[model samples]
Target: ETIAIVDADATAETRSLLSYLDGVRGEGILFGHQHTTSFGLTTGPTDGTTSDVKNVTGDFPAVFGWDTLIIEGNERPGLAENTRDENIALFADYIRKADAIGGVNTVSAHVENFVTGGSFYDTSGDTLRAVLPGGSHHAELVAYLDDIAELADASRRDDGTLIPIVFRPWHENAGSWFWWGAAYGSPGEYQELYRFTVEYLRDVKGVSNFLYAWGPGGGFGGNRDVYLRTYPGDAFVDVLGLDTYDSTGSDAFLAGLVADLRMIAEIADEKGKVSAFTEFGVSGGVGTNGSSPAQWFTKVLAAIKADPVASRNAYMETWRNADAGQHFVPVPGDALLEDFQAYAADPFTLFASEVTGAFDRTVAAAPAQPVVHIASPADGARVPTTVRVRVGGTDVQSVTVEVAQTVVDTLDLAYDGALWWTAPWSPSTYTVTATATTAAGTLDVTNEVA
Candidate 1:
């Protein structure tokens, strides 16, 4: 089932407590932050310690309506190569608070490996390699990750079972901005690094509750090739995400978003993975007085759910409402407040209060073999180079249409809660077959479309 997510920063109590309303009303899940313990302070004297979100927003984000907690796995400040603990207290506090309300914790890491007093472009390969296993800086990286796992380990329930976390590391690597990103490493190198990280955290470190995410930035100049350039593999990734920010609500922005999200959902559905719009919002849209675009949330949310493929994404999380200038979600008296409320009220959207079940453990059931048939284009009808063909099936996740033995496209049946799927067909005289697969089974039905 699809769910809505909220990013709660340092205000788990307020977030969760407020979510009780959403729960009663059935809305979405909570999200949070861990940058202070990982990278630096939310607000501080620049000593590497950060202030809590409550310090800036007044009431906790949850109090306003946010549930999921997304934390950072960045290293604590002033620590030795393998030494930690400068910010473990805050990390512990944050997780404990999340647990107190049964809120989900999703961890992300904005690794400071690029903090070597130079632009990420100038970072040396040797310096970059040092952080990988067996390198000089490897110990430091391991120590940081270890601290994250340990903290998650400690954030347990009264029954002693560790609360599950949706751990997303090495995010937005498709961009050239970060040191560990495409600018500094080959896709193969990055893929290996990601695999090693997952294996280490899961097998070596015994972090079994993690749901790994593979997130990349959008607007790769419409080159779909770069989407999975650094993808580790299906085995290592549970959620597929795209992080795109909007500065000027342009058609290109929305188009790019739709294309990327469609691609992600296509892959996720075929591979039995969950898809999400992990991070998004209007960049610098929020201002000192308040925010602009009173309908920003409504617009984006509509765009997302409008697309058949993109609509299947598990959640779409807007970034934090840091100060007036950097926040993503709305703050008090913000122009987007009413619109956000309306967006949250949509039945299709889920929030912390509306969340039910141990979502982390939920899995899609395999569907029974479906009966497939062609709904358009009479069998012998002559068509143009591009033809629109409609395929219908029952009890199936999606249908893959093929000409001869080559695959052309896959269509999802759940787009509008209907059994019908459609796609434009390339001119082909060979026999056409539609094969549908669910977690439980697969079926193939054939018809000719030329």
Candidate 2:
């Protein structure tokens, strides 16, 4: 499961809508942001009084409180503590309210590039460009992430299971504006920055409960292999998400989603992982440009149907936190969700389901390894103390061959991955077993090579 495809208004109303759509429940990581940040505006608690907690969490029971909760990171803690504290308080309040309502309280952190150190705004405000700065408030951001993690850990469920937190830093890199924007850094620098973040958070900060999500923009035209290139590695990522919108919410925009969807899914499957849609709007964000909201809705339905396995992402959150013309499809208000209800036919099925079949379903099957095929340096082949032995096999996922009590070599594979082994010692009667998984099913082969 790689791609969590969710909408913003995943509140109380979408449940009933799931029945008619396809029985897909909306299980996802809610990307909840400060109303001001969600809309890319200047509204914060510091400006004035905030909305009541009840009004915010009243709809909790509907969409199952935060599966993966998200909060924005600030620049300065001393000057912005009040705002930062307030931001955290509201989320904590929601956790309590969600518990009372009926939902698992999973949470995470999402930080946008606002004040780039000494600067204020990025050059590309109208659109997200790559020329953005990286880490504006270094000192402030470090402290801020630490505080939020602690707060969420303290606010866990009654079971004491520490909530799994995702720290999505520098999202929509394909988009311009923010300081950490990809436009600001070269691909190599972006990878280094990403790697640095993972190392810093895990090694120095000692924050191991966090899952890293690689989120990108959805408007990167057709061919988007470049998005996958910037990723660090399998160990560095847990969920793969993207930010996209279909102004007028048309199928055309949703069409672009398929390529990215398959790419992430294929990658996740290769590494045995999951993915998601970090941000998305039915129509272009208000005044942002694109098709109408209605068009976005219809297109989404088409995308889901066209490629259910790929489109049935793990999370599907929407963009409901906007103001005026900048809004993106109004987060489908309770009423709008009804029209698109049938799209989610089976709520439970769609919420966290990933495609199970292979991309090339028509490929011919590989020949199974013989139960007695044993090549030396394999089981009895005379070899040097430091020699490499190759084990040939068709459709092998992994091989565990051992001699006596000492282990020789092991090989873990991919689709049609051959079983190759390297040993630094003499040959011996080694017991071997290889497991193979394919579009058809799983197969096991055992042999003694000597």
Candidate 3:
């Protein structure tokens, strides 16, 4: 339950694809698009065809939506005077056809308004304070995040793995026509330009795959502080997406898509993180305004599976099929392609041969005991006399709290970091011992409090 890899040197296929999207959430949802092997309603085959969700649901879609918008520039304006490195080699050939078919790629980023260079709906310059870090197009936003950390190490996998990406990057930004929206910056410069692009693509261009998603688009009508009006914390996010689109396909847009996915699945289960709907459709996707594309794809999959914590979303993308009148899911002369093949024969809606080992790989295990915690007096916890000590685990750097009793009333906590504030007696027998350094290199934090 602690698979938090925002690249702490991640890349064993990005920590087994965030441990297979955290054990594939409630075990379903995948279904994706946004240029999956291109061409919809018939056109370019943007990279030699193969999807309109596999020509009407013969599987192939366990999520794969890309768009660094041509590595942050080719946002078309008659190819804005060309050479986006040959459109990023057809965007790394549609991420090697979604890593050859074991799908699941995300990659948002409509970027490129880096100060009126326009595009990405160019919300005229404030451009997130001229591209942060002492502004002025901050080295063209670090050369468009160093071409997404060199396409995350040239999208690896030729058995050299790596491929795992879900690098969303300042998506939706709560509207206002991108340019790091929210009416132009200052949620502390949009959380320091999203923690300086996750500390420059995971600590200075090392770029181990990446899973740094964080969303916001569908007007926060369910208001969890207006859907965290520019969050960017929880150590710079790891997928808790939501992009909303049903514009007005109403039932109040499926009751605001189940109250913003039951408040984003209860804040991605209190921030263990990983939830998505990262870009939904219907604002004219399969048919256009007159709405009702039959069971609107199984009623948007029964409105995010009617909240069992919003059916723990692991995926639900949509936006490809852009041709005959621009698309969003459904082709082959769309007669609603039999309601997207009955929402891909819903059993919860996975595809790509039903996510079976979606890029299978898990090797690396052996170490275990470096665990430490106080995480606030569990097991009938109640020894609070201004106490707040909550040291942590997995190699914590310091912790030396102390507060005993047996008529020798102890008190030695002073580091003031992991809590300490006791001096108003109420001891009910707590000989809570203490000691420091962690990585198990000097432990001992006993507790006999009853």
Candidate 4:
């Protein structure tokens, strides 16, 4: 199967990277780390030539993860003396270094709260609603996007070629800590924010070096509906990612992670998009999760590969090594090191040394038009009294359900919570039409039987 970059004006490298990602699925997931090339448990040489993963396995992770924390006056967790702008440049430089070695570079934004102008963790101020186009904080968001646009433009190779990156923003938004999280706004509002970001960065700014990614943190559990609570839609996104952490290394956590990955794999397959275990780690460090189990890495890998669909992920970030006390990946003499190497030795894990030209491909056209679907009272089923009406669409503006003439005198749909209800009526053979309205035009499906 093939798909196009969401950005119509995507660069050649960007398109190539998308193809490479889709092409590499099922082969193995590329390993990555946050600030992989720069800061680590002990800091780096600043050239991006090394990382803890490399030091242990003699191979750089095939993917590199970076964060936009500097925009909020917070450099990742281990940097000092560098100005905000300087760190931004450092981000771009590290991205180039990662790309130079045939490894993929991806970034996540840990944006500041636009409401109180506090750190991302601050929730004292209302957000999301206010940062939208007409809101007071809208300009602030634009300024932030501009900073990202600069970073996107700055990350280039020696040949002056812009490196393609999986650009993830509003990360782990399912958690309520961030200002733009689920608690601050309705799902529609969150979706609007995500859609607008893509429109602004790709359409307005015209940057084509990015493959937009949408990620939601832990709140979904194993339910698919909850997982897609604030999804930005497939048109504006290319990768369906999950950001989950296991602080205690409990059996339940891994179970949920695997279940979520499988669900994500299924959803991604249906949408023709890529899947990624965007972020994972022992957040509270190994000791916090009891003894650091050497088999933890392999166990995580097994969870990812548990189901055929679950293995669809192209890459997964093992998170960063912030310091001796707070880190994900183990260093020398750590209890998890031996098993970590074994995990690395597995053929399913792709390291930088084993990969070359991972970003090379051609583009395929995307959805030519909108699509609408009816999600109630399965088609061709005999409905007795009230039929549940749920409509889903792509690029939809409004939805209306109506029945054919001479059906129940006049079809009246009652608004129900998440599900619509038709007035009490006798079972009769009638065709129900689910019409969806879009800016461009309207689409309808009239095959749902009653």
Candidate whose TM-score is highest? 4
Query: Tens digit of lDDT per residue, candidate 2, span 206-279?
Result: 55445566775665553547677566445455567677655454446566677666666556556545666556
- lDDT score for candidate 1 against the true structure: 0.52
- Candidate 4, residues 1-450, lDDT tens digits: the string is 346557756777787788778767888888888777666654465467778877778888998888888544476432456665667777787788888777888888878887886787887676676776446677988898988888899888889988998999887878887887878766656765777677678756778799999888753666888888778766678898888766555678777787888788788878777888888766665433434854788888887777677788888887767667667778875788787888899999999887766566656556433444333433444343443433332444456666664554344455454323334444456676766566658776654453
Per-prediction count of colliding residue pairs?
A: 32, 69, 1, 0
Q: Determine the C-alpha RMSD for candidate 4 after optimal superposition of all C-alphas.
A: 9.2
Cα shift from native, residue 230, model 1 (Å): 0.9
Q: For residue 279, what is the lDDT in candidate 3? A: 82
Q: Which regions of candidate 2 deviate over 4 angstroms?
A: 1-89, 99-140, 158-160, 220-224, 283-291, 324-338, 341-450
Top candidate, metric lDDT: 4
Q: How would you encode candidate 1's per-residue C-alpha lDDT over 204-231 as one tens digit per residue?
A: 5666556677797776544557787677
Better of 3 and 4 by TM-score: 4
- Candidate 1 least-lDDT 10 residues: 2-11
Ranking by lDDT: 4, 3, 1, 2
Ordered from best to worst TM-score, the candidate numbers read 4, 1, 2, 3
Q: Give TM per candidate.
A: 0.62, 0.54, 0.31, 0.79
Better of 1 and 3 by lDDT: 3
